[PDB]
Amino acid sequence: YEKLDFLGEGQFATVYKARQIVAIKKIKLGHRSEAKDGINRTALREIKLLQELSHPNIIGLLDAFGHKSNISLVFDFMETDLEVIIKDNSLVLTPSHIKAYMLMTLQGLEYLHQHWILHRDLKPNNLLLDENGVLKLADFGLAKSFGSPNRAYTHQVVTRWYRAPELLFGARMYGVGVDMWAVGCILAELLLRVPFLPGDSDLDQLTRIFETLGTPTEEQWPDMCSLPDYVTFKSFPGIPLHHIFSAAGDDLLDLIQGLFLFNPCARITATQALKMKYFSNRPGPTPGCQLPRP
Amino acid sequence: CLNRIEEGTYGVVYRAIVALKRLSLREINTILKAQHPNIVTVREIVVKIYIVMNYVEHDLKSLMETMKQPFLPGEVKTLMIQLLRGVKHLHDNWILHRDLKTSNLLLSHAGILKVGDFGLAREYYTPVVVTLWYRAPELLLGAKEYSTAVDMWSVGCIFGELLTQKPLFPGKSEIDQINKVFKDLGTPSEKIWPGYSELPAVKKMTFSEHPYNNLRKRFLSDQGFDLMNKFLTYFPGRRISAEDGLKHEYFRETPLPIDPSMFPTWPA
Amino acid sequence: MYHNSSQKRHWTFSSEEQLARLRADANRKFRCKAVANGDPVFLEPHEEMTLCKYYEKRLLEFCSVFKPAMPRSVVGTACMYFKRFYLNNSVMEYHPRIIMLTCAFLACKVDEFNVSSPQFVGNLRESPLGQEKALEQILEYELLLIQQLNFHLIVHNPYRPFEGFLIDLKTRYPILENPEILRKTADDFLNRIALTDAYLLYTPSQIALTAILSSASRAGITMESYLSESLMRTCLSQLLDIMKSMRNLVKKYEPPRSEEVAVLKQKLERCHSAE
Amino acid sequence: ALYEYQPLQIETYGPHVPELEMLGRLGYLNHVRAASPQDLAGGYTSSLACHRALQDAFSGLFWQP
Ligand SMILES: Nc1ncnc2c1ncn2[C@@H]1O[C@H](COP(=O)(O)OP(=O)(O)O)[C@@H](O)[C@H]1O
Ligand SMILES: Nc1ncnc2c1ncn2[C@@H]1O[C@H](COP(=O)(O)OP(=O)(O)O)[C@@H](O)[C@H]1O
Ligand SMILES: [Mg+2]
Ligand SMILES: [Mg+2]
């Protein structure tokens, strides 16, 4: 593994290229108290998660070499992200491209959720596109298993822009819905090329959500008040769905509405979403080799 | 480099005695413009980009964590004097720090408090700044404009932390933080707070009512209470300033501010 | 899930012959390394197995009185890590005490059981100097354990399958008046299966079913009808043979001998002091 | 090239487990702990716990190394 280029840096670790071409994510030590912990918990979590997972639309972990100080992971070279595609104004996103991206994301999440695992960090730059246009989920640092009523994790996991109202209202226990809403947000971004609800504060995020989709009632959320961080809101009428996305068809409107129910139990899942009439409708989703490339 | 003292999201500091912080233009310009005895003194600039600072032995939060007895009032008053001098120097230089917390405060063996972490400082804005445990209600309720009151609140909260060695409003969440502030101080009103209805949060949300001035049960002299209420004035235009706080009668009481030199030693 | 997992693909073996040959290979490898470095001080593989069993019991005792309370999944994962590590390594190279401590630490980290290092060592019956020394050794050997596990850090335990089988018996078996009375005894039997190496030979669902059926047979309740109809000829025979092998392994297991473990511990200390 | 959904199939090497939508019909959820309204608000139901328990009970039951 001959390091040859620098690919960026984040809060979890530092990533750089290497000769097949791969990418090493080397983990830096945490805080002073976290330096005594040893191997970083995010890295161990991601190691086990990608060791127990195998799917064409999930990033592939190859090697996890390291030394005493910390650990370093190795992944396949991922050409670009989805955020690059979205933010690039030179790239025209035909409805087929949106259909293909949503199809890949939904299939990956279907496989992930079948094994009782929540990504909890869904957002466009986390969806990586290869040289063959194969979208793969990544950044499994926050990915945690779900189903057992024993372990409850922090609600403050997803970023503020793509956080479901169940998480924003401080829910200890949740299910697949926390992913699905994020997916919908991504879908909305693919329809507008700008963040759907780009709130700065989390309360402002809630205001944006309720101003765009209308304030939920007890009919659409039977136990909304039961949440501990539940805050009362004024009844916004909510913009009709066809006004926000004028170019989206009726099936796409139904898919978006299903992805954007306020009740997490009634919110559609990956299998249900793949079974909607939108994906089988004309035109067919674009192949991997015909997706836009920067 | 000798050892990494601590890790940060946008900058990591090593010990070398000096401190080498690896990270931009905003922070370096703000730190350069505010050279002062009570402000972190940058020695030079080297190149990733690195900033060299005069090494301090400890910070306030680490000292509080690893010490059992409470603060003696004299050193509390001395630290408040130094903090007020520093924030007034920042205010005179038209600098808003918005990152005042016990972690940022650095205390040396000589009893000198020397603020730093100018990543969130700006020239006077950005809607969401300041940590949740010290953020002012105006920025909590989505006020697009703010002033020195945001640093004044942080100073008041730091004073409250000094008094009891525990955060005043350690809100679990933003809604929880607002609820904690309202419960401990009393919910604001239009009569108390002019321009209340204009706040974006109130226009689109409803809160609960609480009795006024419930913070006294948590704790301080009567002049200490007056100065504390001066910190916890709801109205941003009515909240006291550092210059007037220095002129307050609480700084002249029976436990007079002890000099920085007479400071009990702690492990390094 | 187990049906496509690293544990099934790599860490489940045909029979005890593979386990014995792997342990003998590890012992021979360490002997060759020592003789190349520069004879009666090396312990035989059976003595290594005895010491491994004794220190597995010690790890069980450690996790029993751990504070905060260790979920059964965490201790199960720790035991599986211990067995996996000492299947391909020698007690004469890495000490069992520090290895079991680092196994418990890694199980706490993997199973999302957030406990700080001082908290993790506050349960150690050692001096504060002993506790911090144990901390340094654990930090040193955590990566070694990680590497020796082939980075397969997810371990499936039979407790969840046991709960699932109990639920299924409750709903779809009206013949059994109350499956609950068959839990506790089965739990005890499960503990026995922990002591033996059955974790490396049979999947957790079979282990849980074997424990439940052994508990049923001990109480005299016969439920072959559950397997025949509710669970719906080769498959039934294979399941029955697997249960028979489980019971044979449980019977055949022998607890350690105090004088034997004392002598083996002295010999092990001699080997570790020498090299 | 159109698309038509194919339910992905992986062998569990064990007895068939009922589909998620219909556990409560046979009284499976009767013998589990009822989900509190706080969990129901966030989208958590006892159906998930029961289905996970049953899926892990019947997984790999018929496998031979
Ligand atoms: N498999 C990969 N192949 C190529 N580049 C990658 C791969 N994974 C991550 N990267 C790059 O490394 C960077 C990682 O930073 P990121 O994960 O965004 O930090 P954070 O998670 O703290 O925001 C990204 O900018 C991305 O472009
Ligand atoms: N000169 C110094 N003296 C003492 N401690 C310092 C000094 N410089 C930095 N530190 C330590 O480093 C930490 C600040 O890290 P910082 O650079 O603010 O990271 P970030 O900017 O990414 O948040 C503080 O907790 C402080 O204890
Ligand atoms: Mg990423
Ligand atoms: Mg800082």
Numbering used by the authors:
A (entry chain J): 12 to 30, 36 to 310
B (entry chain K): 440 to 455, 463 to 469, 482 to 505, 511 to 587, 594 to 688, 692 to 740
C (entry chain I): 1 to 38, 44 to 237, 242 to 284
D (entry chain H): 244 to 308
Excerpt from the paper describing this PDB structure:
CDKs require cyclin binding for basal activation, but for maximal activity they must also be phosphorylated on a conserved threonine residue (Thr160 in human CDK2) within the activation segment or T-loop of the kinase. In metazoans, this activating phosphorylation is catalysed by the CDK-activating kinase (CAK), itself a CDK-cyclin complex consisting of CDK7, cyclin H, and MAT1 (7–10). The CAK integrates regulation of both CDK activity and transcription, as it also phosphorylates the C-terminal domain (CTD) of the largest subunit of RNA polymerase II (Pol II) as a component of the general transcription factor IIH (TFIIH). Our data reveal that CDK7 and CDK2 interact via a pseudo-symmetrical head-to-head interface composed of two main interaction clusters in the N- and C-terminal lobes of the two kinases.
To experimentally test this hypothesis, we determined additional cryo-EM structures of the CAK in complex with two other known CDK substrates: CDK1-cyclin B1 and CDK11. CDK11 is a kinase that functions in the regulation of transcription, mitotic progression, and splicing. Among CDKs, it is relatively distantly related to CDK2 (1) but is nonetheless a known CAK substrate, making it a good subject to test the validity of our hypothesis. The kinase-kinase interfaces in both structures are essentially identical to that between the CAK and CDK2. The T-loop of CDK11 is also observed in an extended conformation, pointing away from the CDK7 active site. However, the CDK7-CDK11p58 interface is more conformationally flexible than the CDK7-CDK2 interface due to more dynamic N-lobe interactions, which was reflected in a lower resolution of the reconstruction. Overall, however, these data confirm that the CAK employs a common architecture of the kinase-kinase interface for the recognition and activation of its substrate CDKs.
